[PDB]
Design an enzyme around this catalytic site. Structure first.
Site, PDB file in Angstrom:
ATOM      1  CG  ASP A 115     -39.548 -31.423   2.738  1.00  0.00           C
ATOM      2  OD1 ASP A 115     -40.257 -31.605   3.733  1.00  0.00           O
ATOM      3  OD2 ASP A 115     -38.677 -32.223   2.357  1.00  0.00           O
TER       4      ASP A 115
ATOM      5  CD  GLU B 213     -40.541 -29.439   7.582  1.00  0.00           C
ATOM      6  OE1 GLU B 213     -39.647 -29.616   6.728  1.00  0.00           O
ATOM      7  OE2 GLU B 213     -40.902 -30.335   8.384  1.00  0.00           O
TER       8      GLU B 213
HETATM    9  C1  LIG Z   1     -37.809 -32.209  13.181  1.00  0.00           C
HETATM   10  O1  LIG Z   1     -37.969 -32.074  11.759  1.00  0.00           O
HETATM   11  C2  LIG Z   1     -37.218 -32.958  10.968  1.00  0.00           C
HETATM   12  O2  LIG Z   1     -37.984 -34.104  10.662  1.00  0.00           O
HETATM   13  C3  LIG Z   1     -39.189 -33.842   9.917  1.00  0.00           C
HETATM   14  C4  LIG Z   1     -39.859 -35.184   9.724  1.00  0.00           C
HETATM   15  C5  LIG Z   1     -38.850 -33.144   8.597  1.00  0.00           C
HETATM   16  N1  LIG Z   1     -40.111 -32.850   7.887  1.00  0.00           N
HETATM   17  C6  LIG Z   1     -40.101 -32.917   6.401  1.00  0.00           C
HETATM   18  C7  LIG Z   1     -38.941 -33.696   5.835  1.00  0.00           C
HETATM   19  C8  LIG Z   1     -39.063 -34.840   5.174  1.00  0.00           C
HETATM   20  C9  LIG Z   1     -38.052 -35.316   4.166  1.00  0.00           C
HETATM   21  O3  LIG Z   1     -38.389 -34.934   2.841  1.00  0.00           O
HETATM   22  C10 LIG Z   1     -40.370 -35.609   5.200  1.00  0.00           C
HETATM   23  O4  LIG Z   1     -40.185 -36.985   5.512  1.00  0.00           O
HETATM   24  C11 LIG Z   1     -41.403 -34.956   6.118  1.00  0.00           C
HETATM   25  O5  LIG Z   1     -42.679 -35.549   5.921  1.00  0.00           O
HETATM   26  C12 LIG Z   1     -41.428 -33.456   5.833  1.00  0.00           C
HETATM   27  O6  LIG Z   1     -42.560 -32.783   6.376  1.00  0.00           O
HETATM   28  C13 LIG Z   1     -38.033 -31.881   8.878  1.00  0.00           C
HETATM   29  O7  LIG Z   1     -37.624 -31.268   7.664  1.00  0.00           O
HETATM   30  C14 LIG Z   1     -36.802 -32.223   9.705  1.00  0.00           C
HETATM   31  O8  LIG Z   1     -36.108 -31.039  10.085  1.00  0.00           O
END
Ligand SMILES: CO[C@H]1O[C@H](C)[C@@H](N[C@H]2C=C(CO)[C@@H](O)[C@H](O)[C@H]2O)[C@H](O)[C@H]1O
Length: 537
Positions: A205, A262
């Site tokens: 993550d 990710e």
């Molecule tokens: C566009 O992406 C951004 O926004 C996304 C929502 C994030 N995704 C991860 C980040 C977080 C924080 O732990 C959880 O809330 C998400 O479900 C997880 O998949 C990305 O890391 C962040 O860079």
């Protein structure tokens, strides 16, 4: 034999997969029941969204104890049984590593709040004095990803406001100070703990997180829409040393452990550095995920993924953070904002295009991540009642951003039942409400219909294994800019007609007989908005 390079990974959003306990919450007992369905579909592995102890303020990504399963999901013994059952079905298991931040209820952070400025407890996080004569300004101008300030001010033991702490995401997700030696030590222990239990690897993550610029400089772009990537808040040099250390740890096992990042960074060259041979095995190719239904945009995104991934990227068309593909492609067509558009979605259009897109993406060299429910063609539930929303994006935007709850609705398993077989009769209310029409998408109904989205996925995965060799690279048949995308891999030719008229492939692409298609077709033309896999004679 199994290979990560070609793996098809089923993403299990455990809270919304299957509720065996009857408490309205998907749980490990339900996953155990549904593992047969994942393997029967044709998948090679599962990735579990975080199921550690969590107050669920960001639904598992706010972790209060990294070494225990949340009691709502099950015991550690039940987790061990899930891992062994998955393995018995041939499914490898990825867990979710959330090391940029923890829950504010983690014992370390409670100790930091109770300690004084300058304490070791606070030095494991990022606490700073405020600016302004009374400290009422945040220490810098950074934005939370979820909206609002990236800082929260605390009350000190004299009862007056004092220092602020950094959180890239929700207020309840304080960021670690990755320069404090206890942090890296803790996460090596976390890796070892879960690997000992047979976990095969981790999805990482916020892989562009962990380290920030040590000076925490203001973002000169500001807070606005076109402020740009905050270079001081993400993607720092030290993060590559971190992944070298994790890769070395994982490489000591036999078979070696697997890491997929990710990563959200604008520059493909910056992204590629995470995938150097001593760092992470792969990273999601998000360029394709955010493209509208458009042949040229798909081709360019596929080209970027293939370069960054050195020929075998990790593809995905949806996940728990974006709108489901049936909705994205069913809307009128115009980074992550592109995958969260509002507006009317035509269901039949979205299903047609989602079928074609699944068939295209599963023909690309590399690995493919299927988000639970996409194999059923579920739409995004955009019309969730205000009162039902739980995503911190909803609350922090005061209701002006919908958030992600509409792709996290408990799955339908049977046409019958008050919860469509997601739980038994006697079960509590589901944690998010299923629309009355979800039963129309029930897995059991689709399994009996050879024309269903589920059956198309089963056919794709079967044909992918028999006819598509991972060692065969893409040979582009269509030119840049074409409205029809076409390529050859070995003796398989793939054509996706993005347009609304039938398309007759030029004979130079070969003498073709169809293997499968995302719609009916017995002609040699490719119907509108359809993907065809053909054998080349
Ligand atoms: C566009 O992406 C951004 O926004 C996304 C929502 C994030 N995704 C991860 C980040 C977080 C924080 O732990 C959880 O809330 C998400 O479900 C997880 O998949 C990305 O890391 C962040 O860079």
């Amino acid at each position: 034999a199994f290979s990560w390079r070609d793996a098809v990974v089923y993403q299990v959003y455990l809270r919304s997969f299957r509720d065996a306990n009857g408490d309205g919450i998907g749980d490990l007992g339900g996953l155990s029941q549904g593992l047969d369905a994942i393997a029967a579909l044709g998948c090679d592995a599962i990735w579990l969204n975080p199921c550690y102890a969590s107050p669920q303020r960001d639904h598992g990504y706010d972790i209060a104890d990294y070494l225990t399963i949340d009691p709502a999901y099950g015991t550690l013994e039940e987790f061990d049984e899930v891992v062994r059952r998955a393995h018995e079905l041939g499914l490898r298991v990825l867990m979710d590593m959330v090391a940029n931040h923890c829950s504010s209820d983690h014992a370390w952070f409670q100790a930091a709040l109770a300690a004084e400025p300058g304490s070791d407890e606070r030095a494991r996080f990022i606490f700073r004095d405020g600016l302004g004569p009374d400290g009422e300004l945040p220490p810098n101008n950074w934005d939370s990803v979820f909206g609002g300030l990236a800082w929260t001010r605390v009350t000190e033991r004299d009862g007056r406001p004092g220092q602020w702490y950094l959180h890239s995401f929700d207020t309840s997700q304080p960021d670690f100070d990755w320069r404090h030696p206890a942090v890296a030590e803790h996460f090596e222990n976390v890796l070892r703990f879960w690997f000992e239990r047979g976990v095969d690897g981790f999805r990482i993550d916020v892989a562009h997180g962990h380290f920030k610029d040590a000076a925490l400089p203001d973002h000169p772009g500001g807070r606005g829409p076109d402020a740009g990537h905050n270079h001081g808040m993400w993607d720092q040099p030290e993060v590559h040393d971190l992944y070298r250390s994790w890769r070395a740890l994982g490489d000591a096992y036999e078979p070696e452990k697997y890491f997929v990042g990710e990563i959200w960074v604008p520059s493909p060259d910056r992204l590629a550095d995470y995938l150097r041979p001593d760092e992470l095995h792969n990273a999601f190719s998000f360029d394709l995920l955010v493209q509208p239904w458009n042949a040229d945009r798909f081709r360019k995104a596929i080209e970027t993924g293939l370069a960054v991934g050195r020929g075998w990227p990790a593809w995905t068309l949806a996940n728990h953070d974006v709108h489901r593909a049936v909705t994205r492609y069913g809307q009128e067509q115009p980074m992550i904002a592109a995958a969260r558009r509002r507006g009317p979605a035509d269901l039949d259009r979205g299903l047609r295009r989602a079928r074609a897109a699944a068939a295209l993406a599963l023909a690309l060299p590399g690995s493919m991540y299927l988000y639970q429910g996409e194999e059923l063609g579920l739409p995004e539930v955009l019309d969730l009642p205000d009162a039902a929303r739980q995503d911190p994006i909803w609350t922090r935007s005061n209701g002006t951003e919908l958030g992600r709850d509409g792709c996290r609705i408990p799955l339908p398993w049977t046409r019958e039942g008050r919860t469509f077989g997601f739980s038994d009769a006697a079960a509590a209310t589901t944690w998010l409400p299923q629309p009355a029409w979800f039963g129309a998408f029930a897995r059991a109904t689709q399994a009996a219909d050879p024309d269903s989205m589920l059956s198309l996925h089963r056919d794709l995965l079967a044909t992918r294994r028999t006819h598509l060799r991972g060692t065969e690279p893409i040979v582009w048949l269509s030119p840049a800019g074409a409205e029809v995308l076409a390529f050859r891999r070995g003796d398989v030719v793939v054509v996706t007609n993005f347009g609304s008229a039938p398309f007759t492939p030029p004979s130079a692409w070969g003498a073709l007989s169809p293997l499968l298609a995302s719609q009916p077709l017995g002609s040699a033309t490719v119907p509108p908005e359809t993907t065809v896999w053909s054998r080349l004679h």
